[PDB]
Amino acid sequence: SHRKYEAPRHGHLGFLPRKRAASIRARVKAFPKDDRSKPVALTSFLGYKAGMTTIVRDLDRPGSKFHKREVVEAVTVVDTPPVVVVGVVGYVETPRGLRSLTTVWAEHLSDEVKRRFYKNWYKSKKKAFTKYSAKYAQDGAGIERELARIKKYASVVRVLVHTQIRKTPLAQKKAHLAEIQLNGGSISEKVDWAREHFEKTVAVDSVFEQNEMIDAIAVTKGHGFEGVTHRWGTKKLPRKTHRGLRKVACIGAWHPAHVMWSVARAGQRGYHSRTSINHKIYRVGKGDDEANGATSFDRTKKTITPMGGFVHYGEIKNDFIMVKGCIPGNRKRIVTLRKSLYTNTSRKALEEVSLKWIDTASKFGKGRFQTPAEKHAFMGTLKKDL
Amino acid sequence: SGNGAQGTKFRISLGLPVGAIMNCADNSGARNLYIIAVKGSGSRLNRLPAASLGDMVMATVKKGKPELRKKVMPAIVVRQAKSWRRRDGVFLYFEDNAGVIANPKGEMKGSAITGPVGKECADLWPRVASNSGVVV
Amino acid sequence: MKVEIDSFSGAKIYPGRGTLFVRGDSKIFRFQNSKSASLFKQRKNPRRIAWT
RNA sequence: GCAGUCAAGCGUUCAUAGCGACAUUGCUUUUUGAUUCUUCGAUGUCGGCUCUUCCUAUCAUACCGAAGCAGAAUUCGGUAAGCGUUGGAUUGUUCACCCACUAAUAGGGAACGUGAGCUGGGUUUAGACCGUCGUGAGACAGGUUAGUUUUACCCUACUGAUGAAUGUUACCGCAAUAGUAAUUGAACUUAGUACGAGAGGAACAGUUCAUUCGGAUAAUUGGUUUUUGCGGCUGUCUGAUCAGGCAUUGCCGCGAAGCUACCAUCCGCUGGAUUAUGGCUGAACGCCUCUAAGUCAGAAUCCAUGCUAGAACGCGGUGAUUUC
RNA sequence: CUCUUAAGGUAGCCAAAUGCCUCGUCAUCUAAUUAGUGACGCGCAUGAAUGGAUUAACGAGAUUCCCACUGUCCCUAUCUA
RNA sequence: GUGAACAGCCUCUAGUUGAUAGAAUAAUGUAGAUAAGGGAAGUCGGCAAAAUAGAUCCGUAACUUCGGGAUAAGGAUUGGC
Numbered sequence A: 001s002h003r004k005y006e007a008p009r010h011g012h013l014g015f016l017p018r019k020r021a022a023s024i025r026a027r028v029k030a031f032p033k034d035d036r037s038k039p040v041a042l043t044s045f046l047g048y049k050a051g052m053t054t055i056v057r058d059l060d061r062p063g064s065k066f067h068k069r070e071v072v073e074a075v076t077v078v079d080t081p082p083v084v085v086v087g088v089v090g091y092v093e094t095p096r097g098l099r100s101l102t103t104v105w106a107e108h109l110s111d112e113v114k115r116r117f118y119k120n121w122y123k124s125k126k127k128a129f130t131k132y133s134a135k136y137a138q139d140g141a142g143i144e145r146e147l148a149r150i151k152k153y154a155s156v157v158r159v160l161v162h163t164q165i166r167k168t169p170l171a172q173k174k175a176h177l178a179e180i181q182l183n184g185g186s187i188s189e190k191v192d193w194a195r196e197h198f199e200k201t202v203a204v205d206s207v208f209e210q211n212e213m214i215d216a217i218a219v220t221k222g223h224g225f226e227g228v229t230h231r232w233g234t235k236k237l238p239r240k241t242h243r244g245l246r247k248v249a250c251i252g253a254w255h256p257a258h259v260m261w262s263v264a265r266a267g268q269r270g271y272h273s274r275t276s277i278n279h280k281i282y283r284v285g286k287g288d289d290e291a292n293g294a295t296s297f298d299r300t301k302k303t304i305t306p307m308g309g310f311v312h313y314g315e316i317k318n319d320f321i322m323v324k325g326c327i328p329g330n331r332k333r334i335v336t337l338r339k340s341l342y343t344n345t346s347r348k349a350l351e352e353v354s355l356k357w358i359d360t361a362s363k364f365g366k367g368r369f370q371t372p373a374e375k376h377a378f379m380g381t382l383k384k385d386l
Numbered sequence B: 001s002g003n004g005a006q007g008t009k010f011r012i013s014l015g016l017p018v019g020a021i022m023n024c025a026d027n028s029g030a031r032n033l034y035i036i037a038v039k040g041s042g043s044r045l046n047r048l049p050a051a052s053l054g055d056m057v058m059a060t061v062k063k064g065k066p067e068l069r070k071k072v073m074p075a076i077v078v079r080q081a082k083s084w085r086r087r088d089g090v091f092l093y094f095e096d097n098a099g100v101i102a103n104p105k106g107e108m109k110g111s112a113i114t115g116p117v118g119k120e121c122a123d124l125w126p127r128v129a130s131n132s133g134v135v136v
Numbered sequence C: 001m002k003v004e005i006d007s008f009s010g011a012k013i014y015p016g017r018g019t020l021f022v023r024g025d026s027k028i029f030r031f032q033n034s035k036s037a038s039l040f041k042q043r044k045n046p047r048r049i050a051w052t
Numbered sequence D: 001g002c003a004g005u006c007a008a009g010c011g012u013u014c015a016u017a018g019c020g021a022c023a024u025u026g027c028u029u030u031u032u033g034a035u036u037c038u039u040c041g042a043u044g045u046c047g048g049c050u051c052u053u054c055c056u057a058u059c060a061u062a063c064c065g066a067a068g069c070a071g072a073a074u075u076c077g078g079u080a081a082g083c084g085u086u087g088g089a090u091u092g093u094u095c096a097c098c099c100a101c102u103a104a105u106a107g108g109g110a111a112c113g114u115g116a117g118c119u120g121g122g123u124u125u126a127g128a129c130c131g132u133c134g135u136g137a138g139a140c141a142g143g144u145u146a147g148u149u150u151u152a153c154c155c156u157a158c159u160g161a162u163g164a165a166u167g168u169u170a171c172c173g174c175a176a177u178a179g180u181a182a183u184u185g186a187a188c189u190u191a192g193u194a195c196g197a198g199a200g201g202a203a204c205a206g207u208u209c210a211u212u213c214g215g216a217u218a219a220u221u222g223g224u225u226u227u228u229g230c231g232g233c234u235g236u237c238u239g240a241u242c243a244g245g246c247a248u249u250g251c252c253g254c255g256a257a258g259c260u261a262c263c264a265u266c267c268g269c270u271g272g273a274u275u276a277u278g279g280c281u282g283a284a285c286g287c288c289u290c291u292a293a294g295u296c297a298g299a300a301u302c303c304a305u306g307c308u309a310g311a312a313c314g315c316g317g318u319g320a321u322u323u324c
Numbered sequence E: 001c002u003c004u005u006a007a008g009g010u011a012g013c014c015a016a017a018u019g020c021c022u023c024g025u026c027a028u029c030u031a032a033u034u035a036g037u038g039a040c041g042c043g044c045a046u047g048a049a050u051g052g053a054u055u056a057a058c059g060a061g062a063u064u065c066c067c068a069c070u071g072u073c074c075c076u077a078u079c080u081a
Numbered sequence F: 001g002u003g004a005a006c007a008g009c010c011u012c013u014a015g016u017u018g019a020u021a022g023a024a025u026a027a028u029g030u031a032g033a034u035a036a037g038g039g040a041a042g043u044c045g046g047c048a049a050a051a052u053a054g055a056u057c058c059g060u061a062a063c064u065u066c067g068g069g070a071u072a073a074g075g076a077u078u079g080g081c
């Protein structure tokens, strides 16, 4: 009868249905528009969320109170060792959609990938790609014919690549396999760049650069079955109410005589797939470099990994993308960094950043020290270390 | 904030909902400032409009000169007890909540402000910044 | 950027972490964690707190 | 309740900028009646709270046309229901009234939405007081006070969760269909400029923020503490010690981790096509005319892009396919 | 002076648990008060053991405000059985 | 034993160890807790909850049937040796 007062509804019907995602690697449903006038490169990348730290930098925002001033900012670090190209996929346009024409695999597949094709690896006989590798052993032909079959036909080309997860601190030995679109020029040069990179390895620096705006594709952290109050953000009911206050009072009007798709209901929360955009790269980390957490301004030699390591993760021993703010999904989860879908000037988007300082103190509790060196200074000498 | 603002005000946490009584920090002769409205505020069903430091509220005086009581007047929050966080990243806060009587322009009924004032409030209201002692 | 120092313990306060109290007399106090600050609020004595 | 038509009259002049008498044609069903078809082997009866969705007779916001539009403000109107439409004092109230903020504080529907959703203040049992009426018992739409708010485990619907079968198993993919989302404000500047005698006093472009909303997230700050992790305290118990037990976690301080907060941080896309409208060329009608043919521009709109799910009877590529 | 029917509301009290009009009017309290209190009273329809007025103390009676207090609320979060 | 105390808490004697049991630890409950800043803005109404609390000293208003009101109000103290 026309609700007494107006307020906007609860929750965004565009994120329906709210269910557990169909896989833990979230999908890249869109790739950047191909400009074939450029060299062939990847449009995305695989990594693992390590955790977060803080950052101090001077803001370049002329006209803002904080212009030419020091700000702190939260940043997530993504552990992103390089990827190895095991294959190439042709895609052909049809009146019913994009279709996959052929797939070609490199002759030798890392055991980390082969691990992905098996539910029980230890007791399997690991028949792998074993008969497929004969296609190389026959000198040519069957690989080359399909390789050209792609050139002759495919409109889009993608490389299958997989993470080296042994380089990664996680216990999981099953690597992660993914299709990445090749946005350089000329489908021929694309497939050529592909096979020349078979069994080879590609690094983050080839894809992203500092200050670049990037998007994060990840499955959000699962919370399981949730009441309406915190799943949809409904008002709590009063204390006086029989049979519980965490509900929604009237789930529906008498007509229609069905409760409706648009109404808040208890159920699964989290473990949804999310495409989150417009995160700026504050750092492209350097695997081998020992200045990983250093700065021109703060020259102390230290790595990006905090004290006590990244909680629930490990240490960053590979190249890392340090992106501003926060990102969907939780630590240890495969995540997909994808370069931006649209050319964005903004102002915020084009600002170049250079960090003054990176927090390396422990996240396992409130750290007072940056390097174990700096600790020995303040602490002095203890009964330990006699 | 209010109107008569000099520049912008970045968002800061809200400690002073409607019904709050803050100390009056000027020499106007008012002691209480009891906040009945918040000028800048938006609207949401059942949300109490709440002021932070540098906001211009509307208030009444519950303790002070009788000439000053039983009527509605502007005010400006000089200090807030709830912690907010500056863009530099410190979380800070004052020992009490305080305000000063103003006029719609921001010209203060007071000629002096006893006690500290956050830079936010000062940078936003020059007439407050003039009359004030130590800032932040 | 400037490392400050806990007005109670004497610990190094890096940017971000910790709180800043402003007493009514305008004297400023910085705490590196909710522990120190609490001790201060409990009116404890940093000269008698062993780890300070 | 809402709106037409005629146009005497109003509006200095001047029917129609804005209005409008006498009449007269209507719509509407959030008014009240009229009626008594349905339900009396029972459809829970006011208001509120909560939540969703629809209507448009638009309060704001986008784009416009008109003015008795100089500017500023205002008023009339078109496309518009896309988006929003608040916080309190008294009252059971709906209603009313006031204070206040605000872009604005528009009106309505959904069994006068919503009681196995609440609440039960009101109304409407049985106790009781008063006033009025009655010889009396008792009465009143009069005032007052106290007065039990039951059941879901079925079906459906909704939310989320599995799954037989389409050789087996496994990996990478497609995308039909469905859903979709961001709103609004301020400051600086333009500019004390335009316009005006003056008093006054804009806007586009540019910049910084903000608001409501939404999705994440936990570096930080805060919250939480059976980490019963360290410490401290009471009483009693173990002869003392050391170390402990019991007081439904005995109590206090700190307390990681996890969870979590506009009480914390981050993020929130791009085109095409249209509406009203203004126009081009241009007939009808040798003129004229945005319009008849043709066509340009053009909105908080539409369709996409982007985002979510993936048809468990939609599909593509691929790997490996049994010996006591 | 009249009048029907015997008299014709005295002392007091009042928008009162009694007032229709009614959210009476004035003052007070509040930013705002159909609330409260103090007044006023041709009082629809107060009023004298059908008891009237007052009243200390008492009250799981009804009512208003103040200080304190607080998750009642802003606006929700976490913990244990 | 602690204490004003047949209080509450722990204990000797004595009696019990009986109340289907195993695994987990979602939502919603029932019961028990704590919350930053604001402090009744919530609501018919502070409903619920929170705050107060023992003892010693100090101080204690109007009104009053002189008996009260009164623990009014307001403050300070509190271990151990």
Ligand SMILES: NC[C@@H]1O[C@H](O[C@H]2[C@@H](O)[C@H](O[C@@H]3[C@@H](O)[C@H](N)C[C@H](N)[C@H]3O[C@H]3O[C@H](CO)[C@@H](O)[C@H](O)[C@H]3N)O[C@@H]2CO)[C@H](N)[C@@H](O)[C@@H]1O
Residues within 6 Å of the ligand: B003, B004, B005
């Ligand atoms: N007030 C917000 C909106 O203002 C609109 O109109 C407002 C404007 O016309 C006017 O505001 C002007 C503004 O136009 C202009 N671009 C900036 C100027 N500072 C504002 O007006 C100013 O008036 C005085 C004197 O200049 C200033 O001191 C004061 O700070 C400011 N309020 O004041 C009006 C009243 O606020 C509409 N009334 C309405 O949409 C809404 O009220």
Ligand SMILES: NC[C@@H]1O[C@H](O[C@H]2[C@@H](O)[C@H](O[C@@H]3[C@@H](O)[C@H](N)C[C@H](N)[C@H]3O[C@H]3O[C@H](CO)[C@@H](O)[C@H](O)[C@H]3N)O[C@@H]2CO)[C@H](N)[C@@H](O)[C@@H]1O
Residues within 6 Å of the ligand: none
């Ligand atoms: N307030 C400062 C500036 O002043 C502006 O000035 C506006 C106001 O002074 C005035 O706007 C009025 C407003 O006062 C009133 N409260 C509502 C009314 N519908 C508005 O009307 C105006 O705006 C609407 C919507 O944009 C238009 O459709 C209408 O044609 C126009 N006259 O007219 C101006 C717009 O035509 C705006 N308030 C604001 O956006 C701007 O920043």
Ligand SMILES: NC[C@@H]1O[C@H](O[C@H]2[C@@H](O)[C@H](O[C@@H]3[C@@H](O)[C@H](N)C[C@H](N)[C@H]3O[C@H]3O[C@H](CO)[C@@H](O)[C@H](O)[C@H]3N)O[C@@H]2CO)[C@H](N)[C@@H](O)[C@@H]1O
Residues within 6 Å of the ligand: D184, D185, D269, D300
């Ligand atoms: N941020 C400034 C203020 O907020 C808004 O400003 C917005 C506008 O200037 C502009 O927003 C446009 C809007 O003008 C236009 N009329 C509608 C459009 N949807 C908006 O755009 C927005 O949505 C679209 C998708 O629809 C996105 O592609 C776009 O990135 C997004 N900014 O970008 C700003 C932020 O979105 C209000 N229009 C106004 O109150 C004021 O300008």
Ligand SMILES: NC[C@@H]1O[C@H](O[C@H]2[C@@H](O)[C@H](O[C@@H]3[C@@H](O)[C@H](N)C[C@H](N)[C@H]3O[C@H]3O[C@H](CO)[C@@H](O)[C@H](O)[C@H]3N)O[C@@H]2CO)[C@H](N)[C@@H](O)[C@@H]1O
Residues within 6 Å of the ligand: A346, D270
């Ligand atoms: N204009 C393109 C770029 O993106 C921005 O512009 C975005 C919006 O501000 C802009 O808004 C335009 C509006 O200006 C123009 N006059 C009309 C146009 N339909 C609007 O765009 C939006 O309109 C509605 C919004 O719901 C949508 O239906 C539409 O798809 C959307 N593009 O549409 C753009 C998105 O396509 C900024 N202007 C700037 O970053 C840059 O110019």
Ligand SMILES: NC[C@@H]1O[C@H](O[C@H]2[C@@H](O)[C@H](O[C@@H]3[C@@H](O)[C@H](N)C[C@H](N)[C@H]3O[C@H]3O[C@H](CO)[C@@H](O)[C@H](O)[C@H]3N)O[C@@H]2CO)[C@H](N)[C@@H](O)[C@@H]1O
Residues within 6 Å of the ligand: none
């Ligand atoms: N009377 C005090 C006694 O000690 C205890 O009571 C003390 C504490 O339990 C109680 O703590 C309350 C807490 O329960 C309640 N839910 C919140 C409240 N803020 C706390 O109280 C304290 O709060 C802060 C300091 O933390 C101060 O601002 C405040 O003045 C102080 N009373 O404060 C009480 C003292 O006022 C036991 N409840 C009991 O033994 C007994 O009541």
Ligand SMILES: [Mg+2]
Residues within 6 Å of the ligand: A002, A003, A006
């Ligand atoms: Mg409405």
Ligand SMILES: [Mg+2]
Residues within 6 Å of the ligand: A001, A002, A003, A004
């Ligand atoms: Mg309703």
Ligand SMILES: [Mg+2]
Residues within 6 Å of the ligand: A008, A009
């Ligand atoms: Mg809506």
Ligand SMILES: [Mg+2]
Residues within 6 Å of the ligand: A029, A030
């Ligand atoms: Mg897709």
Ligand SMILES: [Mg+2]
Residues within 6 Å of the ligand: A029, A030
């Ligand atoms: Mg796509």
Ligand SMILES: [Mg+2]
Residues within 6 Å of the ligand: A106, A107, A108, A198, A199
């Ligand atoms: Mg090879």
Ligand SMILES: [Mg+2]
Residues within 6 Å of the ligand: A165, A166, A167, A168, A169, A170, A171, A172
């Ligand atoms: Mg490993």
Ligand SMILES: [Mg+2]
Residues within 6 Å of the ligand: none
């Ligand atoms: Mg290793």
Ligand SMILES: [Mg+2]
Residues within 6 Å of the ligand: A169, A170, A171, A313, A314
């Ligand atoms: Mg490990």
Ligand SMILES: [Mg+2]
Residues within 6 Å of the ligand: A205, A206, A207, A208, A209
């Ligand atoms: Mg590059």
Ligand SMILES: [Mg+2]
Residues within 6 Å of the ligand: A223
């Ligand atoms: Mg869990």
